[PDB]
């Protein structure tokens, strides 16, 4: 009975005895090796003193999206006092999360439950009462301080055993999930509830795509039960931006003057929270935060947007920040300014101290887009009454300088856009202390091309296996391994040159003909230690043994990674091609 | 043949009408008739001689990306490895001799208890995942307010589990780590579901991996909020000898993946004889069952009607002298119950019936393969 | 060929489509309507059909009374009366 | 709402026996006007009249309550329109969108027919296209129920129709490396296994359906109305497709 | 020009005409006249597979000397497009798009991006911990040591 046979064992791994060392921190010395642990550690502590002051804010603003849509949805839940009382006021909450708590009021001589149902606690039309009068029930028995049959006549009973009146809610998490013949018939259940005269339903729909697509499934004569009194209200984190650019500008306060925001990292940010509508903020803050945990882990000038550590400054550091590509900039502007050759050569590394002198200058600066972000995001709301904006492409049009080219679409901004208009200056040193993605780091670790990168690491298979050269000729297959692809990446290549049906044993074929005869019978010789396998070996049927034992667990690899059908059960001979490259 | 090999053109090229001449149908009879033991026998061999020298090297190279995955881990990324090749040695050394003590030591002894979670076995239960996490944490068990009439007690605990951890200090104290997240018997939206909520606690670490080309289609945009997976490609061409032991490779895959019964086979191959003359009577007597209760050839897979109930099985085995009495039959059935090759459960009257979970056609093969030779 | 004749619309028919089902008129396609005994009424709440989670307008439904049996019934003055013989 | 307006309106000039005529005359008219949509209701006709009679009332001044014929076609607008409904119809995403058009495309037309209206790419090695379909077919298909289609058929109608992403900025350094085409990252699944919880994409139904195998096919529901409706906010002329084939 | 002239017949001393004056070696231009003369009878534009097959090999075989030197990158393409006698360079970028996707897979192919030490333009060093996700791969936001020693070099000579 191996572990590996199992499932779900557990572990109690052994520990080592001490590794005579503070240095457990998951940072590693960079520059290949000349970086102090002082600074492994300091860029370690003030990684998390800008990474929490990050989460205390968005932690913060998380809690008011629900505080306001707690109080946004019970100002509209209450009072709306109908003359004609024969009714229940219908609430649509468009595009919402169903993760918000709804507290009702507490408001004596009268009983306030809510009743919460999923499409999971909806199989039929009984479960939904017996549930909600178990709901209702159990939660009239706990603001009290015999049994009764949980059915709709609970509502008839209730001021005969409770002596207060009752006013029940309804709370329908995933509505677009519910089949809607068993919602059509639970409202016209509870629409027999209206003769009792001691109690008010009030139905919460929590419609997370649309009201079109829910009365195309109701049936005509139930919407108009749900007209007499409905109200629409808009859930959503993207209504007017109005949370994203709250966590947006979280963000530029702690990166404020210590860090910059290249504009192919912003509107790389701009595209991908479009590609996902309904959660948007975990996926701003996804990304915000693996560039930010991306920053600190591989640059060695982290610890210098603190200034108490530029009095540290090193000669590895003098190597590597002056291949800054505005530093050779500034170099080209003074020597085709100033003809003589020595104040430049004291800006150059022949000078030990007037470089990191110079180094020294340019940390002090406020950088002023942060700020003036900010100040064009308020001006532009409360002078104009603007709110479907983002701050981010504000932001985005900010770094390249089309700002009034953005701000002409309101078409009000006319008498203010000279004064909000802002060129952009390239600072020195920037590109050391930015956050872009010119790597291609963040779509590959949080959005990547997931089956491309199989096809491609199938069909090409030389960026993934290390070519060696040394190495190959003392081991046991280095002869073979030159000249011999691996069996999936060597399968892939018949496999993708192939039509949507192919037979097994013409597959097969085409294998073995790929493969050389005499190097795989040599390899399979050149072990002395197996007899078992060098008698396998002396057979004239040793190849075409070998090919298809190393044929058939490629093509067994191909089915459970989901590449091939095997059409047709009973007959097991052709398979059917499942995925293209390139799609 | 085709003009275009890959786009949306390659998909629209390739996909043509063949003709009835233009078949060229040969039967895979005509291929040199392979024993097992020799498949094995030359397998092993590609397997452990081939290409190591590259893939240890090419090991070697992305040895060097472990504190750049726990960096990862300890900012509350889920972690999952995608590629060609078998991933589950990689990920086995890095959670239980790199993850574990390093996690441990920056927590100041013991280490961090890492369940792992084969889910290429097809037989991998969601409750019994939950029964031993449950072991680990010892959460406080859900009040009857909690327990919302027929409630999942299951999902149902982790909602009072993620509220509970949302104040407790932000420290790892549990690393699950899931082997083939898309595996047969994990694949389902129940399992799913379980690890989504799972992964939400911040106080366990999740570490998955997936073999699937269209895994991504798994997550919705709740579940990939819940997991929010940092995703790493481990192409390493590994062989798979361990997943490929549960599906059998003879029959190239054909062998309907989720019955459990190919991988039983694999665990009667090395047990005590005592151990599998009990289960051969086992076997014997609820297939007397099944041919008697069903009346019928087709493939029924087994459960509780056709199984034997224990008081009575342990009168079988005393006159063939497998179990001296009770105690050392239920010490030596527990051995099958942990791997799931029979389960034990009572009826509506009391009866403790076990059972083999098994179709009729995978039980009289298996009696026959690896039993009645003894 | 002829004072004219409202057409009403699509939105305005589906009101009218719902009468003639609870009507027993139009029944769905394979249906099962009432059950034998109290298990088997009790088995099928808990299966969830196709053409509840199907749309509307694209429901299979089949026809309680033939167009033949239609012409017998409706008079002669009436203007559909045309219309039941193709 | 009858009984606010008559006085604030400073006509005082009025008695029950033309209150009650006023009200019983808008019933008749009511009736006469949606008799046909309704039938033979009571229900359908009591939501009509309260739905309506404030909308009645609010047009009503000297001329109005005395003769009936001047008032009802000063309340010409609500006895032709019954209103009994409460930018896009989706908030989807811009991927999530377009894969639902190419739900639709697979679904309704043929496998067989596809390489002659998505091809557009130039033949290095020789081979026919697609000839099309050769006669039109006069059953329209979106009116029968949406057939079956696999998932990779569906994400190679994706890409045919996606507009183009990372556009030529003409540089020869720039233009390998560009991949105009877009390919399906981890984006293009979470949306479409979105696009599934949302009841959009439909599958042959089974207790645990597995995504991740082979036997599973899809499908689409929604109505022909909605994917109009889809296709106009990305501008996408998805009726081009459906013209050819009988309209 | 020739990316339209269709059905036309190449001899094989034009072949190594269109690859001698790129000055490829014997191995490379000779398994372009292999991977040629498979295709022949099979191809609709055989220039189209002619001027693919050059220029992927050029930017393959001149790797080391294109990272060095990008002006290599835009010459190339202007050379193309006078020798096949085109007005634009969009249809010679088209052609090389169309014959990479014939040649990805096969065995040459890959032989001589090892050797060369290509992985389409990057190193196998440089391109594992790119395929990996490291956080410690090179970011192209900085020049690089051996374009900062030719600018050291020249600038020192401007100065004096």
Redesign the interface.
């Known amino acids: 009975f191996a572990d590996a046979q199992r499932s779900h064992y557990t572990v109690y791994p052994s520990l080592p005895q001490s590794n005579k060392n503070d240095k457990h921190i998951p940072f590693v010395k960079l520059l290949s090796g000349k970086e102090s642990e002082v600074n492994v550690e300091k860029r370690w502590e003030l990684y998390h003193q800008l990474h929490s002051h990050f989460h205390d804010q968005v932690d913060h603003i998380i809690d008011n999206i629900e505080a306001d849509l707690k109080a946004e949805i019970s100002d509209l839940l209450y009072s709306e006092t109908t003359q004609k009382r024969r009714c229940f006021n219908t609430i649509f909450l468009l595009g919402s999360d169903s993760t918000t708590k709804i507290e009702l009021k507490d408001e004596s001589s009268r009983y306030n439950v809510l009743i919460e149902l999923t499409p999971k606690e909806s199989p039929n039309v009984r479960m939904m009462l017996r549930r909600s009068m178990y709901k209702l029930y159990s939660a009239a028995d706990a603001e009290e301080h015999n049994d009764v049959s949980y059915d709709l006549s609970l509502v008839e009973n209730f001021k005969r055993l409770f002596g207060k009146d009752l006013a029940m809610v309804f709370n329908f998490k995933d509505v677009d999930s519910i089949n809607f013949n068993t919602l059509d018939n639970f409202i016209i259940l509870l629409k027999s509830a209206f003769k009792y005269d001691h109690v008010k339903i009030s139905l919460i729909f929590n419609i997370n795509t649309n009201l079109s697509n829910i009365e195309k499934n109701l049936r005509q004569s139930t919407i108009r039960l749900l007209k007499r009194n409905y109200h629409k209200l808009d859930v959503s984190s993207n209504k007017g931006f109005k949370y994203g650019n709250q966590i947006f500008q979280s963000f530029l306060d702690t990166v404020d003057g210590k860090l910059n925001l290249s504009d192919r990292f912003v509107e790389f940010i701009l595209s991908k929270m479009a590609n996902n509508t309904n959660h948007n903020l975990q996926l701003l803050t996804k990304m915000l935060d693996y560039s930010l945990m991306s920053y600190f882990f591989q640059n060695a000038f982290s610890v210098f947007i603190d200034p108490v550590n530029v009095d540290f400054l090193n000669d590895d550091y003098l190597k590597i920040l002056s291949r800054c590509p505005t530093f050779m900039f500034f170099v080209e502007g003074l020597i085709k300014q100033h003809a003589p050759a020595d104040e430049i050569l004291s800006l150059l590394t022949n000078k030990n101290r007037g470089l990191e002198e110079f180094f020294v200058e340019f940390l002090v600066r406020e950088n002023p887009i942060n700020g003036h972000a900010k100040f064009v995001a308020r001006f532009l709301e409360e002078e104009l009454n603007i709110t479907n904006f983002n701050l981010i492409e504000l932001y985005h049009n900010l770094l390249i300088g089309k700002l009034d080219s953005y701000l002409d679409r309101w078409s009000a901004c006319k008498e203010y856009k000279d004064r909000l208009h802002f060129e952009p200056i390239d600072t020195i040193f920037q590109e050391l202390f930015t956050l872009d993605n010119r790597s291609g780091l963040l779509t590959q670790s949080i959005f990547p091309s997931y089956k491309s990168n199989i096809e491609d690491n199938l069909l090409s298979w030389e960026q993934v296996l290390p070519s060696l050269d040394k190495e190959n000729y003392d081991t046991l297959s280095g002869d073979l391994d030159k000249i011999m692809a691996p069996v999936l990446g060597q399968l892939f290549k018949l496999y993708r040159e192939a039509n949507m049906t192919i037979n097994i044993y013409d597959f097969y074929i085409a294998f073995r003909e790929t493969l050389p005869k005499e190097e795989i019978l040599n390899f399979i010789r050149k072990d002395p230690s197996n007899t078992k396998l060098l008698e396998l070996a002396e057979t004239p049927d040793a190849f075409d043994k070998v090919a298809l034992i190393l044929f058939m667990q490629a093509i067994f690899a191909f089915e459970n990674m989901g590449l091939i059908k095997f059409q047709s059960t009973k007959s097991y001979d052709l398979v059917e091609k499942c995925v293209w490259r390139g799609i | 043949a085709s003009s275009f090999l890959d786009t949306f053109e390659g998909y629209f090229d390739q996909r043509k009408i063949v003709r009835t001449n233009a078949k060229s149908r040969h039967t895979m009879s005509m291929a040199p008739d392979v024993t097992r033991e020799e498949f094995s026998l030359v397998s092993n061999f590609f397997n452990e001689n081939f290409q190591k020298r590259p893939r240890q090297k090419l090991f070697e190279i992305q040895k060097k990306m472990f504190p750049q995955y726990w960096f990862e881990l300890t900012q509350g990324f889920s972690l999952l490895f995608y590629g060609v090749g078998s991933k589950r040695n990689f990920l086995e050394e890095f959670a239980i001799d790199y993850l574990s003590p390093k996690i441990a030591y920056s927590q100041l002894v013991n280490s961090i208890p890492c369940l792992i979670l084969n889910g290429y076995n097809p037989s991998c239960n969601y409750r019994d995942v939950f029964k031993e996490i449950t072991d680990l944490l010892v959460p406080a068990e859900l009040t009857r307010s909690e327990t919302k009439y027929w409630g999942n007690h299951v999902i149902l605990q982790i909602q009072k589990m993620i509220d509970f951890y949302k104040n407790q200090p932000l420290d790892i104290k549990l690393i699950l780590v899931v082997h083939n997240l898309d595996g047969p018997s994990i694949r389902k939206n129940t399992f799913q579901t379980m690890l989504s909520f799972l992964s939400v606690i911040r106080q366990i670490a999740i570490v998955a991996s997936t073999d699937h080309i269209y895994a991504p289609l798994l997550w919705d945009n709740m579940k990939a909020q819940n997991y929010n997976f940092v995703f790493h490609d481990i192409s390493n061409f590994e062989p798979s000898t361990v997943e490929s032991t549960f599906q059998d490779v003879m029959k190239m895959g054909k062998s309907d993946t989720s019955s459990g019964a190919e991988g039983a086979k694999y665990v009667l191959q090395s047990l005590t004889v005592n151990s599998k003359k009990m289960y051969k009577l086992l076997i014997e007597t609820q297939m007397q069952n099944m041919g008697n209760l069903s009346a019928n050839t087709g493939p029924k897979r087994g459960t509780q009607r056709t199984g034997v109930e224990l008081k009575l099985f342990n009168h079988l085995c005393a006159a063939d002298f497998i179990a001296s009495n009770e105690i050392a039959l239920r010490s030596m059935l527990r051995e099958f119950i942990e791997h799931k090759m029979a389960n034990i459960t009572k009826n509506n009257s009391g009866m403790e019936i076990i059972w083999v979970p098994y179709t009729y056609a995978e039980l009289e093969k298996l009696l026959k393969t690896v039993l009645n030779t003894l | 060929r002829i004072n004219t004749i409202?057409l009403?619309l699509?939105?305005?028919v589906?009101?009218?489509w719902?009468?003639l089902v609870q009507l027993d008129f139009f029944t769905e396609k394979s249906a099962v309507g009432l059950r034998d005994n109290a298990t088997a009424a009790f088995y099928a709440?808990?299966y969830?059909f196709?053409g509840?989670?199907?749309?509307?307008?694209?429901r299979?439904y089949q026809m309680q009374i033939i167009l033949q049996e239609l012409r017998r019934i409706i008079p002669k003055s009436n203007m559909y009366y045309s219309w039941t013989q193709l | 709402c009858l009984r606010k307006r008559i006085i604030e309106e400073q006509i005082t000039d009025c008695t029950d026996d033309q209150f009650q005529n006023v009200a019983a005359n808008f019933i008749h008219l009511i009736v006469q006007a949606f008799h046909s949509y309704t039938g033979n209701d009571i229900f359908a006709l009591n939501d009509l009249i309260d739905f309506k009679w404030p909308k009645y009332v609010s047009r009503i001044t000297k001329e109005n309550i005395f003769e009936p014929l001047a008032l009802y076609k000063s309340a010409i607008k609500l006895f032709l329109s019954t209103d009994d409904n409460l930018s896009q119809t989706y908030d989807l995403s811009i991927i999530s969108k377009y894969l639902l058009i190419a739900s639709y495309i697979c679904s309704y037309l043929e496998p067989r027919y596809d390489a002659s209206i998505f091809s557009r790419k130039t033949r290095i090695i020789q081979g026919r296209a697609a000839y099309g379909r050769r006669k039109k077919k006069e059953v329209n298909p979106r009116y029968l129920q949406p057939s079956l289609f696999a998932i990779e058929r569906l994400l190679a109608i994706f890409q045919a129709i996606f507009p183009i992403q990372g556009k030529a900025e003409s540089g020869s350094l720039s233009a390998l490396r560009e991949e105009s085409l877009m390919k399906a990252n981890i984006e293009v699944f979470q949306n479409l296994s979105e696009l599934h919880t949302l009841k959009l994409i439909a599958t042959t139904m089974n207790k645990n359906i597995d995504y991740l195998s082979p036997k599973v096919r899809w499908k689409v529901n929604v109505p022909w109305e909605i994917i109009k409706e889809i296709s106009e906010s990305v501008h996408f002329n998805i009726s081009d497709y459906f013209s050819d084939i009988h309209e | 020009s020739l990316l339209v002239k269709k059905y036309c017949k190449m001899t094989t001393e034009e072949i190594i005409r269109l690859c001698n004056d790129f000055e490829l070696p014997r191995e490379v231009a000779y398994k372009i006249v292999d991977e040629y003369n498979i295709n022949a009878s099979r191809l609709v534009c055989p220039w189209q597979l002619v001027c693919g097959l050059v220029l992927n090999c050029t930017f393959i075989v001149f790797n080391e000397r294109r990272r060095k030197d990008p002006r290599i990158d835009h010459f190339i393409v202007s050379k193309m497009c006078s020798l096949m006698l085109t007005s634009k360079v969009d249809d010679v970028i088209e052609c090389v798009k169309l014959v990479k996707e014939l040649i990805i897979g096969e065995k040459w192919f890959r032989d001589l991006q090892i050797r060369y030490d290509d992985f389409d333009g990057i190193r196998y060093d440089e391109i594992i911990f790119r395929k990996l996700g490291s956080m410690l791969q090179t970011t192209n936001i900085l020049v690089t040591d051996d374009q900062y020693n030719i600018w050291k070099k020249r600038i020192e000579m401007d100065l004096a």
Do not use: A, G, R
């Open positions: 409202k009403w699509k939105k305005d589906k009101n009218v719902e009468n709440s808990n969830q196709q509840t989670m199907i749309p509307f307008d694209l299979s």
